[PDB]
A and B are shown apart, each in its own frame.
Chain A
């Protein structure tokens, strides 16, 4: 029956992974298909790297599709084809299930009275785009992606699973092209909307954290360095050696200490050809971070170039460029008097506000609160006669 197909997988696996299959079949006989869903989940966590996972699932699609939960089936299918090294094959399975729902909900919806098949359809479309990103036809993938994005926002209330898979495709595209900036925002949505019943492994996740740090260092409009260090993903992984030094580069930028920065760069630029072909981006970043930090934290908003020159270890020729760049990118806006020798900034970009800054923000507010109160007594005092 299924016992005979199942037997072959049982032989090839470990003895200690043998009992697990017997329980799957136990539930099938009894006709408890909620309990089968739960049983199936278990194998997949610790052995989706097996081809036994693939096999298992193929037999399951054939004998269960209205029996086990619909959603569990399609989530499996995302997992399955990551394990298939064949792409031609991937396309075949996605289209069989997609076709199968179209006829099915005509019968299915009226008879039960409910259960939507369009949730499956999106999960399916996500995997098709994913397949074209792994075959590296980048024009094709992109264009399915724009179409899919219109489609998601039409659906009123989005399940976290669907939007999680969307955001995976979006990440994969942007680091292949090596647009560091486009990647950064999309991965903040990815880390957020993360599902509780795992499907993005610990192994995968550690390479994603890395990818993010590289992006922030070599970019040119990322200054959310701390947020990554405050996010659970990095809070927990700071304890492994190849995850010491990388973060130390990111923290060197945050406190703007040029002594720490120059030395780490010497080492790691040699190691990593990515920091080396994007060296110029990397050198600029500390000096920009420094500019925006000094105005914001100060209650003054005019600074002599002397102060800026000493901080960023630049000549006066390069303070003038740095200030100009901030203005182009839109990270500061202002105007420059090279005749008074000031840079009068007039706007600061809001950014992340950390423990230290709240204290500074707070004090400014106490001063104006007290100022109105003092001032108000005189205005009570004067014009006493009339308050009608």
Chain B
């Protein structure tokens, strides 16, 4: 490891554990697999590390002794997912660190763990599953004893409009200056990803709110030019979040959900019923006023 034969050393420990499991303790088989996983990050074979993790389960961390190992495992799985750039997964491993009995009780120890969650949850694509996860976070009071994390997360739990050159500037001397969020190295190339998140969140808002809008107007909002804006709507119609139709000459982009004849009329039946309940209760309070005066 110290030598240049670091690369040979990874292949050695790795091959071994396929056959061997011995008459070893629980604590030792896991101890060897954690070691093996690290080596394969260093060697740069991330796929090998993926194979390695699944031999032990997460039914072998229920015991309090194995918490030091539970934590080391949950930390490792993060570095793996970070390389393949799937942030949904990263946050969920970190969520379980926070849910650790050890981590939770100590003041100092919840602070970075929670902070780290917030950054990778937002960076995940914005879908239906995203919705329920970022609002669980929002409800916690640990987060409200901080203000730095709270300002970023708050933006995507509302369904307001927001614009990239503004969001970029706000957090530039806060969290772009904290590494393992934005502005690190690999994280310098994730500051560039933050752009996509803002747009894809905006399109949710805009579809619901505008039933019809000009495209020429749309490219301002998202802070894009025409080429970018069409691509991002097309992908997003396929994903199932929104349903839309986009016109290529440079006319109008209509966001809509299909509504049949029968459906529109059903709403119109319910209006009518509800109006007649309104009028009956009104007659009762008039009768009632005669008693008052």
Chain A residues in the interface with B (C-beta under 8 A) = 321, 324-325, 327-328, 335-340
State the Cβ distance, A35 to closest chain B Cβ, in Å: 38
Q: Is the CB of B209 within 8 A of A338?
A: no
Residue of B158, B159, B212 touching A338 (CB-CB under 8 A): B212
On chain B, the number of residues with a Cβ less than 8 Å from chain A's Cβ atoms is 13
Q: Is the CB of B210 within 8 A of A338?
A: yes
> Known: A321-B161, A324-B161, A328-B159. Contact between A335 and B209, CB under 8 A?
yes
Enumerate chain B interface residues (CB-CB to A < 8 A): 158-161, 205, 209-214, 217, 252
Which one, A324, A327, A339, contacts B212 given CB within 8 A? A339
Question: How many whole Å from A76's CB to the nearest CB in chain B?
Answer: 37
CB-CB under 8 A from A340, the residues of chain B are 212
**Chain B residue nearest in CB terms to A333:** B209
* B218 closest partner in A (C-beta): A338
Closest to B252 in A: A339
Contact of A338 with B213 in the complex, beta carbons under 8 Å: yes
Least CB distance from B231 to A in Å reads 22
Q: Which residue of A lies closest to B141 (CB)?
A: A139
Complex contacts, A321 vs chain B, CB 8 Å? 161
Would B210 and A335 count as touching, CB distance under 8 A?
yes
For B214, list chain A residues within 8 Å (CB).
338-339
Report the separation of the CA atoms of residues A270 and B209 in the bound assembly, to the nearest whole angstrom: 38
- Given A328-B160, A336-B209, A338-B214, 13 more contacts at CB 8 Å? A321-B161, A324-B161, A327-B209, A328-B158, A328-B159, A336-B212, A337-B210, A337-B211, A337-B213, A338-B210, A338-B212, A338-B213, A339-B213
**Closest A residue to B251 using CB positions:** A339
Contacts of A328 in B (CB 8 A): 158-160
| Residue in chain B with minimal CB distance to A320 | B217
A239 CB → nearest B CB, Å:
31
- Tell me the minimal C-beta distance from A216 to chain B in angstroms: 23
Residues in chain B near residue A327, CB distance under 8 A: 209
Complex CA distance for A248 and B201, rounded to whole angstroms: 41
Whole-angstrom CA separation of A336 from B161 in the bound complex? 14
CB distance from B15 to the nearest CB of A (A): 56
A260→B214 CA distance, assembly (Å): 36
Residues of A within 8 A of B213 (CB): 336-339
* Minimal beta-carbon separation of B210 from chain A (angstroms): 5
Among B158, B205, B209, B217: residue with most chain A CB under 10 A: B209
Q: Complex formed: what's the CA distance from A328 to B159 in Å?
A: 7
Which residue from chain B places its CB closest to the CB of A327 in the assembled complex?
B209
A325 CA / B210 CA spacing, docked (Å)? 13
Q: Which residues of B contact A335 (CB under 8 A)?
A: 209-211
